[PDB]
């Protein structure tokens, strides 16, 4: 049930009045969430796509990225966080009673445009991660509405981030990756080697379902909480990277302050925009009007979705499988620059 | 320059000889000075067959 | 393709209120001068080049913007710092001796601004600086038929200022009225101003 | 003619030719020589004269191969080392001493010995004629070399003490004085040096050498190995026809040489090596594209371009009789490495759309200039990218102002990851500021290992010292007088630290400097932009021997009427202005530059193009390139003014109509 391949044709088509920049999936109900370059934010249905459920203009400029999360507590609603180019981060509310969008709070703190926003929950507390063009990635608190840590881990501004526990990555414009611990506020190790700026970078999560790149190697790496990271850049390449284990407030190793290229995956004809992980497959998109599917075991593209869009392909996602609180539904959706979005059913 | 400043402050005639021979100076400093006392008269002598003096200085004299 | 049979540039672009403002500032009565002044004022994208050998437009545009304008030159020390402070403040800047062009301000001439959200910044010298949005750049050069760099000549709007027959006639007739009958000329100019104000009203 | 002595028995050169089996990738090495009769004969006699302790001056037409015969003779011997000095229009004695200070030591026994105690040094000097006469007709460099060989030494300037030259042989190279740009040469200096006339190789010899080159190239494509001879014959015939047709009388930069054909061979190798599976039509189109990018870029007039196209058609038909040949116009050969993983032909529309999206990204990221994309500018992007991807790949863009030269260079440099560097040279900037910015650029290229696309505008050069610095930077891999004494020693320390940081280990200064200059040649591209080629400064910049022999001259020129029509339509297509009745006028075919008129938009672009033509005709511009900045500015002001006027007129009419209705 974790070995699903999407079919060669889209199940149906979703049309947006302007170009699509980010698409997200509702974890519980079959609802697709679509962003828009013109500032719109659509919310379609997986079966009735004739009319949007809710759409509004909260951002005066182009939306950059967004992600969803459903609240859980030990003592029950969906949160959508949307970033844009208007130097503002907007956190929304998706009520299930009347299926409408409610603005929670419009938040500031970035002197330039904000690229990537990440939302995660730990021990019945939901937090916001965000990186922008001001050379600083910022970790936030949702209830307080204020920042928690601010630092410059790179020479210039950063593209994308992802959070696994208390450790955060940051895809930067200087072809580097950096792990910076939140409570200590220091860099762990520096990883470089790319020739073009990073477009999307995210963690590799351990699984217990055997995938080579999704299993622990040593006991030290099992205790650390992370072993691998995947980075997509404009070098037309997807690279799996190695994170040295620090002396866990971890202390960086002077002789092991550099990363290691575990594997280099090549075969895209243009920049790799966004990537996704599902089982042993490394789903990826690019600007060559195509979507690939790379096996972590072999490093070869098993399927090619040629001419999926008429133009560039912007964003795609799957459902998170490492978390048992989210059902691993077998849905896939990919958004492109041709003002269209397509879903894949079964 | 010092004598031009002093003779502007406290008066007195002043005369410049062969101003075509310091073309950079007459293009910058004298142009700035004339571009921007009651008994102060400054005379400039020059050669007709020599180098071309700047137009705005001649139209401002 | 159709066009107006008795079209006039002044009757199309130079509106009556702007004409009143220009004539109040000290602009001459010439059709040529009015056309050139409207040409200069209608260039909000590319900076205009003024070539006025009589140094009249310096005080004309100085009187247009009041006391917020500042006069700079390419031959004065610290001109870069003065322009830096002026673009920080956001005041209209007129640069004198335009034929001695300084290639530092080539980013300002080409309008190659780097937009940073709601703040627009430009890289001049060796460091960036914010642009207030009220900044207006004028380049003045009192030397006619001089040498101009090809970069500046291509990227600015060259506007000449030469004296024609009507200017000579108007100046001579005004001078002889002032020297012959001051009261008659005063009544004439007061009636002209009153008639123009009445038409505007 | 072929008499020689082998080890006291007379023989000939027929059995002395060594068989050469060039591999595919050996063509990129610049030291590769094809041993023919003339090459081996000249190499042997040059080496014989050199061992006789004499000066050698190699006189010949440009591209005849003086430097390559030199390097062929001196590579096969450990006795001599080559020092590269390349003179400019105004070269001084201090430049010669600085290019020798790195290679020599001052020992008091003064005495200027070479650093190596077993190897002699050959002080090469190219373009001896290029130093200019004084007010009274004398040359400092030529008389310095005459002193350097006749008296074997020179007088040092600061401490006025006489030095003695021990093991510094002198080898010169110059063009005939009949060639424009050269001056008569004093007999008091030419007496001390023997002269060799290295002439142009014959057509058969060139055909054989380049048949060998194409065998080496087509070793990559085994199924087309039997077609190696017609390609060489066609290339040699094309070179001969281009030399005979386009002469110096038409344009001053129509100086062709076998170096152009070698660049053609190298481009063919690069395209084949970075290419997909190839067919005969693909080879014909690729060879035609390489010929277009090597020979026809320097052409100015449209008539010369059409003549070159017809000549290419005639050559292809005559020498390679293959059918199914497509159109070989300039814009119909779009070979790209952008849209795919390899250098292959691409369609027009998808390439244009890709350029649209990437230019949108570039405008969003680096700087916002709303440029309109047309086919000719796409072709210029492709040739600029092809020039930039090469190793040691420089370029000299020539065209009218506001053609889009520097912005295109920035866009292409951003596409390939090059870090653009522009000097902040302005008024009140001496030679020291330019020296510092070049030193910083060189250090960033070498120590920091950063890809740098340095841009030098014509206005960025104020005095000829900057031009000579660029000449030395292009001709060699670096410039000698940047690093002297303490700066030289600290750069050696920094470069040793960088080398041991990388992991590579060597101790000799010479090999470290070769690594340094190789890194500079690999990670530094210089792009020139010239606005008015009729100026004396621009003419001297173009006619410089080092700038001519290395840069790829890309004569973009003024905008033709097709480009103007394309940009006009693609910029005014967003204006609501087709709100009136139009009668299609009865006009001639030659009177309309655009498509035949059906609406008002084509009439608007036609009347604007016609007014630009009339205005530039009436200004007595002659053959001076015509700036299209007026056309763009007028069109933009037209768009803004018609939008404002339509809004005001609509508001006024609506207000008066509702007032009358009320
Ligand atoms: N075997 C050969 N015989 C003659 N010429 C050759 C041979 N091999 C290559 N060449 C040509 O000689 C050129 C090198 O000439 P070069 O030394 O640069 O001339 P110049 O000294 O005038 O700059 C090369 O471009 C190449 O095309
Ligand atoms: N096709 C075009 N459409 C609109 N503007 C253009 C076009 N080509 C060039 N330009 C103008 O030219 C300018 C850039 O030219 P640039 O390369 O800087 O010229 P130069 O190299 O002579 O300095 C831009 O500001 C742009 O407005």
Task: Provide tags for this entry.
part of a larger assembly; 4 chains; A: 346 residues; mainly beta; 4-stranded antiparallel β-sheet; 1 helix; 27 strands; B: 61 residues; mainly alpha; two-stranded parallel sheet; 3 helices; globular; binds adenosine-5'-diphosphate; Dynein heavy chain, cytoplasmic (chain C); dynein complex binding (chain A); cytoskeleton (chain A)
Describe the structure.
- The structure is cut from a larger assembly and holds 1 copy of chain A (346 residues) and 3 copies of chain B.
- Chain A has 346 residues and is an all-beta fold.
- Chain A has one domain.
- Helix content of chain A is 2%, strand content 47%.
- The termini of chain A are close together.
- Chain B has 61 residues and is mainly α.
- Chain B has 3 helices and 2 strands, in the order αβαβα.
- Chain B has a two-stranded parallel sheet with strand order 1-2.
- In chain B, β1, α2 and β2 form a beta-alpha-beta unit.
- In chain B, 5% of the residues are buried.
- Chains B and C meet through α2 and α3 of B and loops of C.
- The structure holds adenosine-5'-diphosphate (2 copies).
- The site of one adenosine-5'-diphosphate has 13 residues of chain D, from α13.
- One adenosine-5'-diphosphate binds next to α13 of chain D.
Summed up, what is this model?
This is part of a larger assembly, with one copy of chain A (346 residues) and three copies of chain B. Chain A has one domain (11-346).
Spatial arrangement of strands, main beta sheet of chain A: 1-27-26-25
What is the makeup of the main sheet of chain B?
Answer: 2 strands, parallel
State the separation between the terminal residues of chain A, measured CA to CA.
11 Å
Q: Indicate the radius of gyration of chain B in whole angstroms.
A: 12 Å
The helix tally of chain B amounts to 3
Name the largest protein-protein interface in this structure.
C-D, 24 and 26 residues
Q: Strand tally of chain B, please?
A: 2
Structural class of chain B: mainly alpha
What characteristic shape of chain B results from the CA principal axes? globular
How many structural units, i.e. domains of chain A? 1
Helix content of chain B: 40-55%
Order of helices and strands of chain B: HEHEH
Strand-residue proportion of chain B: 5-15%
Strand-pairing-aware structural class of chain A: mainly beta
Strand content of chain A: over 45%
Tell me the number of strands of chain A: 27
Level of helix content of chain A?
Answer: under 10%
How large is the count of helical segments of chain A? 1
Distance between the termini of chain B: 19 Å
Order of strands across the biggest sheet of chain B? 1-2
PDB class: motor protein
Keywords: Enzyme, AAA protein, motor protein
Entry title: CryoEM structures of yeast cytoplasmic dynein in the presence of ATP and Lis1.
Chain A: Nuclear distribution protein PAC1
């Amino acid at each position: 049930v974790l070995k699903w391949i999407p079919r060669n044709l889209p199940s149906c088509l979703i049309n947006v009045e302007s170009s699509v920049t980010s698409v997200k999936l509702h974890p519980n109900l079959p609802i697709v969430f679509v962003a828009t370059d013109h500032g719109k934010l659509y919310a379609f249905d997986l079966f009735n796509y004739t009319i949007p459920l809710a759409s509004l203009q909260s951002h005066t400029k182009a939306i950059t990225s967004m992600d969803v999360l459903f609240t859980n507590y030990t003592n029950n609603y969906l949160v959508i966080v949307t970033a844009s180019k208007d130097l503002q981060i907007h956190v929304f509310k998706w009520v299930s009673e009347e299926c409408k969008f409610q603005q929670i709070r419009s938040l500031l703190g970035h002197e330039h445009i904000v690229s990537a926003v990440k939302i995660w929950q730990k021990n019945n507390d939901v937090h916001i991660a965000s990186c922008s063009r001001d050379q600083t990635v910022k970790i936030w608190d949702f209830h307080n509405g204020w920042s928690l840590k601010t630092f410059q881990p790179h020479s210039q501004w950063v593209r994308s981030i992802d959070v696994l526990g208390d450790y955060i990555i940051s895809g930067s414009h200087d072809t580097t990756l950096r792990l910076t611990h939140w409570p200590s506020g220091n860099g762990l190790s520096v990883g470089t080697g790319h020739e073009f700026p990073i477009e999307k970078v995210k963690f590799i999560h351990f699984i217990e379902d055997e995938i080579r790149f999704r299993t622990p190697s040593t006991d030290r790496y099992k205790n650390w909480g992370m072993q691998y990271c995947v980075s997509a850049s404009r070098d037309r390449t997807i690279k799996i990277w190695e994170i040295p284990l620090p002396t866990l407030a971890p202390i960086p190793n002077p002789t092991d302050s550099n990363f290691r290229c575990v594997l280099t995956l090549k075969g895209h004809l243009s920049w790799v925009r966004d990537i996704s992980i599902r089982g042993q497959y490394l789903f990826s998109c690019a600007d060559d009007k195509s979507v690939r599917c790379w096996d972590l075991n072999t490093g070869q593209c098993l399927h090619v979705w040629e001419k999926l869009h008429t133009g560039f392909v912007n964003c795609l996602d799957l459902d998170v499988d490492f978390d048992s609180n989210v059902t691993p539904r077998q849905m896939m959706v990919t958004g492109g620059l041709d003002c269209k979005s397509n879903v894949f059913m079964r | 320059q010092e004598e031009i400043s002093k003779s502007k402050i406290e008066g007195g005639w002043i005369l410049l000889q062969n101003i075509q021979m310091s073309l950079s100076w007459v293009k910058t400093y004298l142009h700035k000075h004339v571009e921007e006392h009651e008994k102060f008269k400054m005379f400039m002598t020059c050669h007709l067959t020599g180098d071309k003096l700047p137009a705005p200085l001649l139209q401002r004299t | 393709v159709k066009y107006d049979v008795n079209y006039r540039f002044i009757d199309y672009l130079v509106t009556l209120d702007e004409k009143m403002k220009w004539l109040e500032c000290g602009l001459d009565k010439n059709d040529y001068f009015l056309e050139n002044m409207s040409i200069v004022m209608n260039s909000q994208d590319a900076v205009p080049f003024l070539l006025d050998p009589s140094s009249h437009m310096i005080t004309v545009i100085s009187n247009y913007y009041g006391n917020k304008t500042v006069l700079l030159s390419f031959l004065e020390e610290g001109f870069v710092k003065r322009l830096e402070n002026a673009v920080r403040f956001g005041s209209v800047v007129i640069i004198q001796d335009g034929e001695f062009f300084d290639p530092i301000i080539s980013r300002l001439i080409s309008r190659e601004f780097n937009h940073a959200g709601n703040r627009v910044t430009v890289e001049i010298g060796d460091h960036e600086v914010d642009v207030s949005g009220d900044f207006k750049l004028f380049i003045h050069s009192c030397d006619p038929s001089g040498d101009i760099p090809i970069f500046l000549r291509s990227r600015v709007r060259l506007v000449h200022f030469v004296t024609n027959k009507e200017s000579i006639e108007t100046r001579i007739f005004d001078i002889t009225l002032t020297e012959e009958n001051a009261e008659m000329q005063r009544k004439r100019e007061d009636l002209i101003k009153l008639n123009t104000e009445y038409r505007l009203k | 003619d072929y008499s020689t002595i082998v080890i006291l028995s007379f023989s000939s050169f027929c059995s002395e030719i060594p068989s050469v089996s060039l591999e595919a990738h050996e063509v990129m090495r610049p030291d590769i020589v094809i041993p023919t009769i003339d090459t081996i004969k000249h190499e042997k006699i040059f080496y014989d004269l050199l061992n006789s302790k004499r000066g050698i001056i190699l006189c010949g037409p440009p591209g005849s191969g003086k430097t390559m015969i030199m390097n062929n003779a001196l590579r096969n011997s450990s006795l001599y080392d080559v020092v590269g000095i390349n003179f400019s229009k105004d070269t001084t004695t201090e430049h010669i001493l600085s290019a020798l200070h790195r290679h020599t030591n001052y020992v008091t026994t003064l005495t200027l010995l070479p650093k190596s105690d077993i190897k002699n040094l050959v002080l090469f000097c190219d373009e001896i004629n290029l130093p200019k006469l004084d007010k009274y007709g004398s040359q400092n460099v030529v008389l310095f070399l005459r002193q350097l060989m006749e008296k074997q030494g020179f007088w040092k300037t600061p401490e006025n003490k006489w030095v003695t030259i021990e093991r510094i042989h002198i080898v010169g190279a110059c063009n005939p004085p009949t060639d424009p740009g050269r001056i008569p040469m004093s007999e008091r200096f030419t007496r001390h040096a023997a002269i060799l006339y290295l002439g142009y190789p014959s057509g058969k010899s060139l055909s054989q050498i380049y048949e060998i080159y194409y065998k080496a190239i087509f070793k990559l494509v085994p199924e087309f190995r039997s077609y190696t001879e017609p390609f060489a014959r066609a290339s040699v015939h094309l070179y001969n026809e281009c030399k005979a047709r386009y002469s110096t009388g038409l344009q001053s930069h129509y100086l062709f040489s076998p170096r152009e054909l070698t660049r053609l061979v190298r481009g063919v190798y690069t395209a084949i090596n970075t290419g997909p599976r190839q067919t005969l039509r693909s080879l014909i189109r690729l060879w035609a594209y390489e010929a277009w990018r090597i020979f026809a870029d320097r052409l100015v007039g449209v008539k010369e371009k059409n003549s070159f196209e017809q000549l290419l058609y005639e050559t292809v038909d005559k020498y390679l009789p293959n059918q199914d040949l497509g159109n070989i116009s300039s814009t119909s050969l779009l070979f790209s490495g952008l849209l795919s993983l390899d250098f292959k032909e691409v369609n027009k529309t998808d390439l244009v759309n890709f350029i649209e999206e990437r230019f949108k990204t570039f405008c969003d990221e680096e700087l916002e200039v709303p440029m309109v994309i047309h086919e000719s500018m796409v072709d210029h992007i492709l040739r600029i990218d092809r020039a930039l991807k090469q190793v040691q790949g420089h370029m000299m863009l020539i065209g009218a102002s506001r053609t889009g030269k520097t912005i295109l260079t920035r866009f292409v440099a951003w596409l390939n990851g090059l870090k653009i560097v522009q000097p902040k040279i302005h008024r009140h900037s001496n030679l020291s500021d330019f020296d510092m910015i070049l030193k910083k650029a060189i250090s960033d290229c070498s120590l920091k290992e950063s890809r740098t696309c340095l841009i030098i505008d014509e206005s960025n050069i104020l005095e000829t010292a900057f031009l000579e610095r660029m000449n030395t930077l292009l001709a060699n891999a670096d410039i000698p007088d940047l690093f002297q004494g303490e700066e030289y020693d600290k750069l050696l320390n920094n470069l040793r630290n960088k080398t041991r940081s990388l992991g590579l280990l060597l101790d000799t200064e010479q090999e470290l400097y070769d690594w340094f200059v190789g890194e500079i040649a690999k990670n530094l591209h210089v792009v020139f932009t010239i606005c008015d080629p009729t100026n004396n400064k621009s003419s001297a910049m173009i006619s410089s021997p080092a700038l001519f022999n290395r840069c790829i001259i890309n004569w973009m020129g003024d905008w033709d009427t097709k480009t103007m029509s394309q940009v006009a339509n693609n910029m005014v297509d967003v204006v609501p202005m087709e709100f009136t009745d139009f009668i299609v006028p009865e006009v001639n075919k030659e009177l309309v530059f655009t498509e035949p008129i059906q609406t008002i938009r084509d009439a608007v672009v036609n009347i604007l193009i016609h007014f630009d033509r009339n205005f530039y005709q009436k200004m007595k511009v002659g053959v001076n390139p015509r700036s299209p900045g007026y056309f763009i500015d007028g069109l933009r002001a037209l768009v803004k003014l018609v939008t404002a006027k339509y809004q005001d007129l609509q508001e006024n009419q609506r207000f008066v109509n509702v007032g009358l209705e009320k």
